[PDB]
Design a protein around this ligand. Structure first.
Ligand SMILES: Cc1cn([C@H]2C[C@H](OP(=O)(O)O)[C@@H](COP(=O)(O)O)O2)c(=O)[nH]c1=O
Length: 129
């Protein structure tokens, strides 16, 4: 896979962010994760976590997987990086997201994220507390 440039337009919530990609505004949905809803336990903490990671980043990058690049809502499907750190992975490592929505052909980082989830669960972090 390849990292491509983007710039933050604005934080939205734990697993969606609005970025400028190839000069066009897009909502991106983070591949391979599910964050709780804002009104569910750890929803607000997941939003806050993603917000801080993307807002504090000097360099945002988008990495598409090998399959579908947009979902049925027109959201971009990607791995998002903040100064070389994957937001998708970081959410799961902190117990603020579950590995989820693992579709065949867009699952390159599945084992990386499952390892993060196993570490978060072992540490009883957040959703695993
Ligand atoms: C993460 C992801 C979500 N989706 C769709 C499936 C879900 O459909 P439904 O809306 O019909 O439930 C929805 C979940 O996203 P959210 O968790 O943002 O709601 O997004 C994909 O099609 N591909 C994906 O990779």
């Amino acid at each position: 896979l390849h990292k491509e440039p983007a710039t933050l337009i604005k934080a939205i919530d734990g697993d969606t962010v609005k970025l400028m990609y190839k000069g066009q505004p897009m909502t991106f949905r983070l591949l391979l994760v599910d964050v709780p809803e804002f009104n569910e336990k750890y929803g607000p903490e997941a939003s806050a976590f993603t917000k801080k990671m993307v807002e504090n980043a000097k360099k945002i990058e988008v990495e598409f997987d090998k399959g579908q690049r947009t979902d049925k809502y027109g959201r971009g499907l990607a791995y998002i990086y903040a100064d070389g750190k994957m937001v998708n992975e970081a959410l799961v490592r902190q117990g603020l997201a579950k590995v989820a929505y693992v579709y065949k052909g867009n699952n390159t980082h599945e084992q990386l994220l499952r390892k993060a989830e196993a570490q978060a669960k072992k540490e009883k972090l957040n959703i695993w507390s």
